[PDB]
Amino acid sequence: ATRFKKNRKKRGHVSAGHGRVGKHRKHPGGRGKAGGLHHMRINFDKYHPGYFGKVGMRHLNLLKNRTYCPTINVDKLWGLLPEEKKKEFSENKDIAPVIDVTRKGYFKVLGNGKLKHNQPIVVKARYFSSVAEKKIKAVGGQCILVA
Amino acid sequence: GRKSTIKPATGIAVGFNSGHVVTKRNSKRKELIKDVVREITGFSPYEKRIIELIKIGTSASTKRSLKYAKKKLGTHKRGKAKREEIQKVVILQRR
Amino acid sequence: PTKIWRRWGRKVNLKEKRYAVCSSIAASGVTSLVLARGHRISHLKEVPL
Amino acid sequence: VAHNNVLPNVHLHKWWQHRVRVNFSKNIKKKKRRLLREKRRKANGGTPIEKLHPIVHCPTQRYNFRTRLGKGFTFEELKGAGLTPRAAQTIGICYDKRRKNRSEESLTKNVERLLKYKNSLVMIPLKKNKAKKGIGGIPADADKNTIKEFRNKKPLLSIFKKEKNTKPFYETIEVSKIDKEFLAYKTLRRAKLAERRKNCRQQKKDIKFKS
Amino acid sequence: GAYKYIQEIWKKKQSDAMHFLLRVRTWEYRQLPVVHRVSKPSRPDKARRLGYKAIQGFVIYRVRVRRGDRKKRVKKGIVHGKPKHQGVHKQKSTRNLKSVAEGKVGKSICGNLRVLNSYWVGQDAVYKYYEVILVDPNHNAVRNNPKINWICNPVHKHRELRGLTSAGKKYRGLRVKGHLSAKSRPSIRANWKRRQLIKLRKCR
Amino acid sequence: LSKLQYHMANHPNDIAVVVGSITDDKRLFSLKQLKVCALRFTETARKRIEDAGGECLTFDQL
RNA sequence: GAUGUUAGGAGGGCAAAUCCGCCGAAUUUAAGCAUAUAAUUAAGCGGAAGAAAAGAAAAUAACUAUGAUUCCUUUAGUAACGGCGAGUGAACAAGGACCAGCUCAAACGGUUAAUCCUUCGUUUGGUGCAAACCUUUCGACGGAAUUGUCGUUGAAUUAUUCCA
RNA sequence: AUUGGAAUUUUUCAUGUCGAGUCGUGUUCUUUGAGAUUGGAGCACUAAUACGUGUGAUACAUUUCACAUAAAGCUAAAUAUA
RNA sequence: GGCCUAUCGAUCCUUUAUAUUUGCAAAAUGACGUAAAUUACUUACUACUGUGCAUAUAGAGGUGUCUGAAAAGUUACCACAG
């Protein structure tokens, strides 16, 4: 590290890259976030707009795991098949892939993107978006609610 | 809320009775002591005051008694319970 | 004065480490590189021994 | 400038240099753990220091599909599987009094696991063959030919802990055997909306039962 | 049988009989020296439940302590400091007056004797009067006994100053368990030290 | 890969050159092959392109 | 309850890194300062050990639930606290290291306490050169104690098997 | 070769027990993450018996349901070691 | 809104308006409402549901040293940084 640092660039130059007029002082604005509102307000406004004051209720003891949900969009569901499985379904319209999204850790199925139309697929999941259910039904697939 | 005890869970993930599929697999002696202790000890001054209020036997006296008990005893369930116990004792005493 | 910690544990990935071993073994294969490294090697029959 | 961050998140003002500890003992601790485990493993006649903690379900909706080692023995359930409390204590197996699992599928699976462990284990005669197996009060007193042969034979097969479940290599169904009439999104919302009313009815049910 | 009756009688604490017994005991206690041996325990029921045994190495001692807050130890009243922190009156010490009573016997008379436990007995406005259960580990019976014998261990001299009386578990908050316990369970010091600590280590 | 195929759609000549890395797609069937020169190939992308009957071409080969 | 140079014994003191108890500030920070901060820290007086402390549920959850403690990885700079300014700030799950249980008291046992202890004794073993240690049941004579010692964990009653 | 004990197992019969100036409440001060008070301590008032009462992080009443068994005690190990 | 150029105030805080929108954390408080059913711990179906607290939005209460510290004197006894 020490080979390449700023001291090696400035070593004989007296004011050290920190200004002959200025003369580098211990804490020339005071500590940390102190100048907010008071004299660094312009910095806070232009770079940190939401910062000051309160919003909303207090939950007091939230717990993350109650609301924990990983989501997946329908577009990427056929991608959860390996290559040979995807070829096999593409060939054969007699059978649908069943997809248990839980093994892949997902719990809500969302509606984004296109599908290769006229091919059934069974989606098993806890939760589905309104659009996702409609598109899965539209393409001839099935939605299965399961805990 | 309200997890089932009698109708099996239906595989529905909304947190009702439901959830994932499953089948659940599920005097005399103290009373004699109490009577003896009361014969030895009688009643506390607040108990006596409550007895007088309950004996008066009005909506006003009974409200007063409950407030007095709640103020002294603190715990509301306990105060109601003590008032109930004393009321029963006054009923028993009359016989 | 020196504090005890001066970054004793650095990472460098599993994939990076593996790559270095494979590439170094490959390099060891190469006849020119063996001579270039300063090993005397003229009378060896050929470098992959 | 300073548009990188609003704050320093550092907070070391409670005299950190007094409080501080520097840690780089890792591998040396692991070697000590290995040495300790080697000494124990060898000392007990080669008899396994591992002990079965049976299979239990992981808490809340995040991990409810997941299953792990618990403290899964309970004597009444174990005795129902076939084995005495005293035998379980003698091999040092992983009892707990207050765990008491509440479901039939969990119990039925775990009694099978217990039965497998019970049959699998075989015990040297304590005083060098002055007593018998009996009726099961502690199972499976060995003979000398078998115990010597078994001790020489370390396990070939896989570990005795956690286990894998359903395939990623997905199952299939015929396209004419599916429904197209269900609405899950409507069902979830309607269920949640009607929930309060059902809870009120259930409250009255509880009172009616209790009277 | 007898102890159960004594328990229920003693629980009430009001009544002519209880009030008489309290007044008579309070009178006798007011006369007596600070720390003294008693022949038999003042409340036998309370003694049994707090682990007194009639065994020779078990001795009971009665203790006098003054009541109320202790007042800050500062010369000529008020002293220098921030308005937030003056605290001359209403300072209300962390350790219990019960522990203080155990401590007085623990420092003055214990040695040979070791503090086992202690109970309330009775009080007026100026004083609380406590009875302390003590045990000698030097005496043969306790060393012989396969029960109790842990009190013989070297770590148990001066339990009241070790925080290892019943009162000590109480004021250290170890009776509290669960989420309410917070930064206290391995030791209040230990937990605070872990949080105050930053580990320098291989990775994050 | 989706963007590469989407771009190449009007080209019956198959030789794509990419001065960057070609990444795979897990969001569609991705059947139609190409002949692609790129700076770097993801292993999954390369395997798919080769399987489909395409060509994964070096810059020296180009 | 006193008194005893009564007989047998103990405590006291030193040292302190880690450990535990009390008691307990300010510089400092906010570019000032009074709340907050520094900090439940420094100093002060005490107590321990080779580690201690904590520990066997008046626990967490709301699941298909988990199930003494410690510790690591983590949650998490998050819920949250705060002249809501400066700043401050947890817990549960999960992956592991590692895992060990329990007993008093009360309840129950009155054929006369099945208990306990001091003093005096006494012998079946074993080492060591010797010092010495180490096993070993049997009697006295004293006391303690039913203001409660010991046993026991509902109670019998059957068959089995084990253990001393 | 005596004595003794335990564990199960039948069959009867027993439904007993469960730590109080403590919990709790009011109040104060302290303390904390605790917020219409988190723990501590001082003070005042002071409980209930297992169908109790302690919990379920917003004051409350009326009621669930789940989970626990306070106010007595001990205990190796991983851990710490200027 | 005032013929035009002049006639005034952030966040936190307080207070009242507003909603077929919300929360108070395992549950419930309109209401057994409406239907059926009743050998009951019955089953459906309902857009508008306790006190108290918390929000969200909209004003207003104020900062004239007017981009908003809860702030008097004195030192010829003085100290220090410049």
GROMACS .gro file of C-alpha atoms (C1' of nucleotides) in nm, chain D residues 9 11 13-14 19 33 37 40 51 53 56-57 59-60 63-64 66 68 71 86 96-99 101-103 127 131-132 134-135 162, chain G residues 38-42 56-57 61-68 77 87-89 93-101 160-164:
model
   66
  300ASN     CA    1  -2.286   0.493   1.050
  302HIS     CA    2  -2.048   0.490   1.642
  304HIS     CA    3  -1.746   0.700   2.066
  305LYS     CA    4  -1.799   0.472   2.370
  310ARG     CA    5  -1.349  -0.223   2.453
  324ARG     CA    6  -1.159  -2.908   1.859
  328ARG     CA    7  -1.296  -3.495   1.941
  331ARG     CA    8  -1.305  -3.861   2.299
  342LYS     CA    9  -2.642  -3.916   1.938
  344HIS     CA   10  -3.170  -3.585   1.763
  347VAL     CA   11  -3.874  -3.160   1.378
  348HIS     CA   12  -4.038  -2.871   1.187
  350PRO     CA   13  -4.088  -2.230   1.310
  351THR     CA   14  -4.309  -1.972   1.132
  354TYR     CA   15  -3.928  -2.201   0.724
  355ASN     CA   16  -4.238  -2.424   0.783
  357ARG     CA   17  -3.803  -2.695   0.638
  359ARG     CA   18  -3.424  -3.015   1.113
  362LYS     CA   19  -3.451  -3.290   2.070
  377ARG     CA   20  -3.389  -4.644   3.077
  387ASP     CA   21  -3.637  -3.348   2.627
  388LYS     CA   22  -3.936  -3.331   2.867
  389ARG     CA   23  -4.107  -3.016   2.737
  390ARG     CA   24  -4.081  -3.047   2.358
  392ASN     CA   25  -4.487  -3.255   1.941
  393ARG     CA   26  -4.859  -3.224   1.866
  394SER     CA   27  -4.915  -3.394   1.524
  418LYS     CA   28  -1.965  -5.735   3.253
  422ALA     CA   29  -2.643  -6.123   3.168
  423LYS     CA   30  -2.878  -6.128   2.868
  425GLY     CA   31  -3.399  -5.975   2.839
  426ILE     CA   32  -3.738  -5.877   2.691
  453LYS     CA   33  -3.065  -3.444   0.821
  806A      C1'   34  -1.936   1.084   2.689
  807A      C1'   35  -2.134   0.649   3.037
  808U      C1'   36  -2.470   0.236   3.351
  809U      C1'   37  -1.765   0.399   3.143
  810A      C1'   38  -1.291   0.615   3.459
  824A      C1'   39  -3.333  -2.695   3.311
  825A      C1'   40  -3.897  -2.269   3.157
  829A      C1'   41  -4.425  -1.859   1.868
  830A      C1'   42  -4.896  -1.819   1.603
  831C      C1'   43  -4.586  -2.245   1.227
  832U      C1'   44  -4.674  -2.855   0.915
  833A      C1'   45  -4.438  -2.477   1.503
  834U      C1'   46  -4.007  -2.494   1.835
  835G      C1'   47  -3.826  -2.639   2.355
  836A      C1'   48  -3.186  -2.554   2.996
  845G      C1'   49  -2.724  -0.064   1.227
  855G      C1'   50  -2.678   1.095   1.804
  856U      C1'   51  -2.828   0.620   2.033
  857G      C1'   52  -3.031   0.107   1.964
  861A      C1'   53  -3.629  -1.764   1.395
  862A      C1'   54  -3.200  -2.005   1.088
  863G      C1'   55  -2.665  -2.215   1.019
  864G      C1'   56  -2.333  -2.415   1.353
  865A      C1'   57  -1.955  -2.498   1.806
  866C      C1'   58  -2.144  -2.761   2.208
  867C      C1'   59  -2.535  -2.998   2.481
  868A      C1'   60  -2.666  -3.321   3.082
  869G      C1'   61  -2.934  -3.319   3.409
  928U      C1'   62  -4.133  -6.018   3.331
  929U      C1'   63  -3.636  -5.825   3.309
  930C      C1'   64  -3.248  -5.606   3.496
  931C      C1'   65  -2.925  -5.416   3.894
  932A      C1'   66  -2.652  -5.409   4.362
   0.00000   0.00000   0.00000
